[PDB]
Amino acid sequence: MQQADSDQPSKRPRFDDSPRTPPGVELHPDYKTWGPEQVCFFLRRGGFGEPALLKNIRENKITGALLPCLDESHFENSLGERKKLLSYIQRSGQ
Amino acid sequence: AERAPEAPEGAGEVGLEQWLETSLERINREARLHFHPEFLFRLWNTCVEHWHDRHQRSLDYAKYRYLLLMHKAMYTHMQQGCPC
Amino acid sequence: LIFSRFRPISVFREANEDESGFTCCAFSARERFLMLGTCTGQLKLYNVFSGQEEASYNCHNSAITHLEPSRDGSLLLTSATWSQPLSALWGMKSVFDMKHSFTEDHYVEFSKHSQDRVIGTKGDIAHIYDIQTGNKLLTLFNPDLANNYKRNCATFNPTDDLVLNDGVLWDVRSAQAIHKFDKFNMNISGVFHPNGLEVIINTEIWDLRTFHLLHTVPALDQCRVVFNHTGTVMYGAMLQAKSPFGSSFRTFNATDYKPIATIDVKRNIFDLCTDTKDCYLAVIENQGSMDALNMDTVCRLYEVGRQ
Ligand SMILES: [Zn+2]
């Protein structure tokens, strides 16, 4: 009796019922067009989604065009991480 | 008095996983026709950074909350009037 | 002028969700129920008196944008946002089943006098369907006269003689355009006054007999307009061309088009509706933020008359 294409689960995901036990769409082809939001997705895929870093990316309105021009002193404003991030951005696709 | 009709047989049967990913696929394709990726990523990033990372919820819960936000955004936009 | 006072008395939330996502509301045929549509396609019936969720149905794969029960409680029309089928007709009498779908029609409504027909809208085209068979009875489209309104909703006049579609006036039994109303906005296509005498397109109020302009009413700009059962008052809530929904609704007098009140609910209004006895006003309210995260949307019930 129920149309299977309009059907939904009866159980809805609830916060207090959904603990973590331990992608969706794609970026623009050229880095230059990225807003700070697309830059944050990019940074998170590299393992650099420290909540402080992405906050600065947003406050300082750092775009994708800007993203190649940066240094570890910027990244301070955890020396080992800054080296990896600097390396990540270097070796990347766009 | 006024009675409310019985639910159809078979309502609620579909699994979360299957429903979630089919939904995410459909709305994402559709949204890309109406929104610029910055907006799309603004909804995705908040949901994942907030529900998945800070509040340590499953990715499925985060995706589910993104789904809810995209639906409402699609709703707003089409009520406003779509050029195409 | 009792439509100057509204007292919030009740609130409805989705009972099984962290965040409510009502997108639509309509009282049931016999007004025992508030029918609330949700942003994922569900329909939910709340008992107005008890306040409890009495039923839940799965209707579409996108947000519900419109709900119209038939006066006889036999049928329900629904519309979605972007998922096909966009509209559908449902049975209401024993089991909830889909009678017919209108795949490409993003808005539907019953004929007014005898509710035996459904008029649907696909862009600039209006379709008229028979309720029993679901067959398309006719297609109203005149390419020459089109205004191309972005929010076009075709609609029957009170007596089902006439159709307003994309700012064009159609005579139903000859199936021919008899007047194009000139275009003064991009979005609102317009509506019949319940008195069957005037047409309200956006700001402009036209006279059907003479096609002379009667009033221009700047307050109505981009407002979704709603008449009370007796045709004495229109409610109005903006949806502009940060959230585009107005934070407030204005009531007017339907005879002289003069303001009566300007009510601020301090929340984004997604939709509103009112019962026939003019006791209650239900308003879908959304928590506006520059913050994407907060999109909790509830239905607040108002008592009209009471401060
Ligand atoms: Zn669009």
Residue numbers in the entry:
A (entry chain C): 1 to 22, 34 to 88, 93 to 109
B (entry chain B): 2 to 85
C (entry chain A): 1075 to 1315, 1327 to 1392
Sentences from the paper on this structure:
Here, we report the crystal structure of the ternary complex of SIVmnd-2 Vpx bound to the N-terminal region and SAM domain of mandrill SAMHD1 (SAMHD1mnd-NtD) and the WD40 domain of the cullin-4 substrate receptor DCAF1 (DCAF1-CtD). The side chains of amino acid residues H35 at the C terminus of helix α1 together with H78 and C83 at the C terminus of helix α3 constitute a zinc-binding motif that links the helices together, similar to that observed in SIVsmm Vpx (Schwefel et al., 2014). Residues 1–22 are in an extended conformation, and residues 34-109 fold into the SAM domain, which consists of four α helices packed together by interaction of inward-facing hydrophobic amino acid side chains. These are (i) a Vpx-DCAF1 interface on top and side of the DCAF1 propeller, (ii) a combined interface between the N-terminal extended segment of SAMHD1-NtD, DCAF1 and the Vpx on the side of DCAF1, and (iii) contacts between the SAM domain and Vpx on top of DCAF1. One feature of this interface is a “trapped” region where the Vpx N-terminal arm wraps over SAMHD1 packing it against DCAF1. In addition to the ternary interface that “traps” the SAMHD1mnd N terminus within the complex a further DCAF1-independent interaction between the SAM domain of SAMHD1mnd-NtD and SIVmnd-2 Vpx is also observed.
The SAMHD1 triphosphohydrolase inhibits HIV-1 infection of myeloid and resting T cells by depleting dNTPs. Vpr and Vpx from HIV and SIVs target the cullin-4 ligase substrate receptor DDB1- and CUL4-associated factor 1 (DCAF1, also known as VprBP) from their host (Bergamaschi et al., 2009; Hrecka et al., 2007; Le Rouzic et al., 2007; Srivastava et al., 2008).
